[PDB]
Design an enzyme around this catalytic site. Structure first.
Site, PDB file in Angstrom:
ATOM      1  N   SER A 105      79.998 -64.077 -46.077  1.00 48.52           N
ATOM      2  CA  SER A 105      80.660 -63.025 -46.883  1.00 48.52           C
ATOM      3  C   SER A 105      79.688 -61.837 -46.988  1.00 48.52           C
ATOM      4  O   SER A 105      79.131 -61.427 -45.967  1.00 48.52           O
ATOM      5  CB  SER A 105      81.192 -63.637 -48.185  1.00 48.52           C
ATOM      6  OG  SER A 105      80.221 -64.429 -48.851  1.00 48.52           O
ATOM      7  N   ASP A 122      93.939 -65.606 -47.152  1.00 51.29           N
ATOM      8  CA  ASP A 122      93.008 -64.563 -46.666  1.00 51.29           C
ATOM      9  C   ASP A 122      93.730 -63.593 -45.732  1.00 51.29           C
ATOM     10  O   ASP A 122      94.608 -64.060 -45.025  1.00 51.29           O
ATOM     11  CB  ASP A 122      91.818 -65.144 -45.901  1.00 51.29           C
ATOM     12  CG  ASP A 122      90.761 -64.060 -45.730  1.00 51.29           C
ATOM     13  OD1 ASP A 122      90.199 -63.629 -46.768  1.00 51.29           O
ATOM     14  OD2 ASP A 122      90.565 -63.627 -44.573  1.00 51.29           O
ATOM     15  N   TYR A 180      87.447 -70.890 -47.287  1.00 50.61           N
ATOM     16  CA  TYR A 180      86.066 -70.352 -47.327  1.00 50.61           C
ATOM     17  C   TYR A 180      85.124 -71.359 -47.999  1.00 50.61           C
ATOM     18  O   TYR A 180      84.047 -71.647 -47.453  1.00 50.61           O
ATOM     19  CB  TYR A 180      86.028 -69.022 -48.093  1.00 50.61           C
ATOM     20  CG  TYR A 180      84.650 -68.640 -48.550  1.00 50.61           C
ATOM     21  CD1 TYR A 180      83.780 -67.980 -47.700  1.00 50.61           C
ATOM     22  CD2 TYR A 180      84.185 -69.002 -49.801  1.00 50.61           C
ATOM     23  CE1 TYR A 180      82.484 -67.663 -48.096  1.00 50.61           C
ATOM     24  CE2 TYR A 180      82.894 -68.703 -50.208  1.00 50.61           C
ATOM     25  CZ  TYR A 180      82.043 -68.031 -49.351  1.00 50.61           C
ATOM     26  OH  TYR A 180      80.774 -67.729 -49.749  1.00 50.61           O
TER      27      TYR A 180
HETATM   28  C1  LIG Z   1      89.500 -62.059 -52.463  1.00 52.93           C
HETATM   29  C2  LIG Z   1      88.286 -62.135 -51.588  1.00 52.93           C
HETATM   30  C3  LIG Z   1      87.286 -63.205 -51.983  1.00 52.93           C
HETATM   31  C4  LIG Z   1      86.269 -63.525 -51.060  1.00 52.93           C
HETATM   32  C5  LIG Z   1      85.640 -64.875 -51.019  1.00 52.93           C
HETATM   33  C6  LIG Z   1      84.303 -64.953 -50.254  1.00 52.93           C
HETATM   34  C7  LIG Z   1      83.035 -64.347 -50.839  1.00 52.93           C
HETATM   35  C8  LIG Z   1      83.117 -62.856 -51.030  1.00 52.93           C
HETATM   36  O1  LIG Z   1      82.432 -62.279 -51.798  1.00 52.93           O
HETATM   37  O2  LIG Z   1      83.945 -62.285 -50.168  1.00 52.93           O
HETATM   38  C9  LIG Z   1      83.969 -60.843 -50.138  1.00 52.93           C
HETATM   39  C10 LIG Z   1      82.653 -65.098 -52.083  1.00 52.93           C
HETATM   40  N1  LIG Z   1      81.788 -66.139 -51.919  1.00 52.93           N
HETATM   41  C11 LIG Z   1      81.557 -66.735 -53.127  1.00 52.93           C
HETATM   42  C12 LIG Z   1      80.775 -67.844 -53.444  1.00 52.93           C
HETATM   43  C13 LIG Z   1      80.778 -68.257 -54.762  1.00 52.93           C
HETATM   44  C14 LIG Z   1      81.483 -67.559 -55.744  1.00 52.93           C
HETATM   45  C15 LIG Z   1      82.229 -66.442 -55.433  1.00 52.93           C
HETATM   46  C16 LIG Z   1      82.294 -66.026 -54.094  1.00 52.93           C
HETATM   47  C17 LIG Z   1      82.988 -64.972 -53.410  1.00 52.93           C
HETATM   48  C18 LIG Z   1      83.860 -63.963 -54.098  1.00 52.93           C
HETATM   49  C19 LIG Z   1      85.214 -64.530 -54.580  1.00 52.93           C
HETATM   50  N2  LIG Z   1      86.114 -64.629 -53.430  1.00 52.93           N
HETATM   51  C20 LIG Z   1      87.214 -63.835 -53.218  1.00 52.93           C
HETATM   52  C21 LIG Z   1      85.618 -65.537 -52.403  1.00 52.93           C
END
Ligand SMILES: CCC1=C[C@H]2C[C@@H](C(=O)OC)C3=Nc4ccccc4C3CC[N+](=C1)C2
Ligand SMILES: CCC1=C[C@H]2C[C@@H](C(=O)OC)C3=Nc4ccccc4C3CC[N+](=C1)C2
Lengths: 314, 314
Positions: free
Chosen positions: A159, A260, A291
């Protein structure tokens, strides 16, 4: 009080400056000979602002291991190399692939806006490179000196961490690393790019996806067309410059129970890399998976994705 | 839900097993060349259950430094070597005295009841001793190997930490340390003993002082007459056996704005040590001061006590 960003259940950023981290996995202290995995880890300083968790697996020979530099994700604003969510993943990955792990503790937004994270991860990578041919100053890790194989250096992230790895690969291309160290291979699990495509993202997904870039880099020149978030922007650096020989891009289809919508964005990115004249080995792995499953390793699909990333390291 | 121990604002232990520590000082990550002090620190593993923050000050010569092993206090159940309350103290102390600092991260009650803390701190001390004459396995600290002077090893603690140091000194006396390492000197800042004296503690102070022993070692053999809390109990180990040549006992008169009532207890302890036939150098320092002022360093009396402890290291 009122909030600017209500991203429950991950983060709340209040008008009054308070940051509530709702998803903050517990701290896990350093450990020698972990009962489950035989992995050992320690938290070491790189600068006054940057540190890393360094991992070594059960040792047999004197034999040198690939170096796996990991850059955690989570919104540019959540979690830690030192907390269980990313630590548990890196620990298991180290045990399975038999690598020296270096999980970077970089400064989080909104307390430290971008490009802090980019600077920190570049500084950490140069720190890793600085150990080449030292078979010692107080900052140098004897694990890396003794067991790190600079011929098999990998850089990996998820991410926003994968966004950091992207920008670090461009930089490794332009600047070079200390001692002539070259990154052999890199992994992007769930890339974080924003690119205009022919199909608009849905309102809710657009808000909950782009918010991380907006809160982390509010004053970005070009906004969401900044070259560091949009790798095919007018002013973007040539992808032919990527400073690795091998690249694994791993894509998923779900964020928890939410569909997604990054398929189109990641397709444009991959097509651009393939069309760039970068003459490296490109690997894509596209799963019908959440994810989160990579990190938790509770599900068969989670274990498959884990094993796919493990296969990229030889 | 209902609680067993409501020690607001520090710790709540619930009938349903939950432990709330709401006012724990923040985590402070490893740092190289701290701007304020020039001290560097790292978090290193000793075992699968015990770790330590190791500190090195700005270096001038190749010259070796005293080794300062610290055991934080706070109820046997609060705070961390890695959180600012104790870390800030040890950092400043390291800068001022120019020592190698080793602040032990031992397991806390109630999750790990005593004698876990005692075992952990013994294991950590033996780990420090194991570096003698190494000028290396993956667990060995190059800071200790290169800069640690085993002729000037000090062991120090506060409150329950001082109780741990007491029990560790008895043990160092009986068992001996690896390589023939001897502890030169030890510091107890605010000793934590429970001894019957001729004057009863007041109801409120008795409850708020003895609670830590009760929650950390429930049904300890002998209760509050267990030799590890009452060092003059019928079956208590001979104080002549203390495994150090020099001892500083520092006493204070206030817990924040509350009159402390340990004067009589600590008097009985000191009289017993002096009457034991221990032929070491005893130093007592009795201040009209708040326990907390040593750590915060905001007040002149705080700075006086800091400087008194610094004078014990030569
Ligand atoms: C709606 C888009 C979205 C993306 C995902 C991937 C990634 C992130 O930040 O993606 C941009 C995350 N990894 C995490 C690991 C642990 C807690 C939160 C996250 C996030 C943000 C929350 N989320 C939503 C997860
Ligand atoms: C009224 C008796 C009493 C003792 C004092 C000394 C010492 C302690 O545990 O002593 C027994 C603590 N150090 C801390 C450091 C940080 C948070 C709490 C503590 C305590 C417990 C609270 N307290 C109460 C302070």
């Amino acid at each position: 009080d009122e909030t600017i960003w209500d991203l429950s259940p991950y983060i709340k950023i209040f008008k009054d400056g308070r940051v509530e981290r709702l998803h903050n996995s517990p701290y896990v202290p350093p450990s020698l000979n972990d009962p489950e995995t035989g992995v050992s880890w320690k938290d070491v300083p790189i600068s006054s602002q940057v540190s890393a968790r360094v991992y070594i697996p059960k040792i047999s020979d004197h034999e040198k291991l690939p170096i796996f530099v990991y850059v955690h994700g989570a919104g540019f604003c959540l979690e830690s190399a030192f907390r269980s969510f990313f630590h548990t993943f890196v620990k298991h990955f180290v045990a399975e692939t038999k690598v020296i792990g270096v999980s970077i503790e970089y400064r989080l937004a909104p307390e430290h806006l971008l490009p802090a994270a980019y600077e920190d991860c570049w500084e950490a990578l140069q720190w890793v490179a600085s150990h080449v041919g030292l078979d010692t100053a107080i900052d140098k890790d004897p694990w890396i000196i003794n067991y790190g194989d600079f011929d098999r250096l990998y850089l990996a992230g998820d991410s926003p961490g994968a966004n950091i790895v992207h920008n670090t690969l461009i930089r490794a291309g332009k600047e070079k690393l200390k001692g002539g160290v070259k990154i052999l291979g890199a992994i992007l699990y769930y890339p974080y790019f924003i690119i205009p495509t022919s199909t608009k993202l849905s309102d809710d997904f657009e808000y909950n996806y782009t918010c991380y870039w907006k809160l982390a880099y509010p004053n970005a020149p070009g906004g969401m067309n900044n070259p560091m978030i949009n790798p095919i922007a007018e002013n973007a650096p040539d992808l032919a410059g990527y400073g690795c020989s091998r690249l694994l891009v791993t894509l998923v289809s779900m964020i928890s129970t939410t569909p997604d919508e990054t398929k189109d964005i990641n397709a444009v990115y991959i097509e651009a890399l393939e069309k760039s004249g970068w003459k490296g080995e490109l690997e894509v792995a596209d799963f019908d998976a959440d994810y989160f499953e990579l990190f938790t390793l509770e599900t068969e699909m989670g274990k498959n994705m884990f094993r796919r990333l493990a296969s990229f390291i030889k």
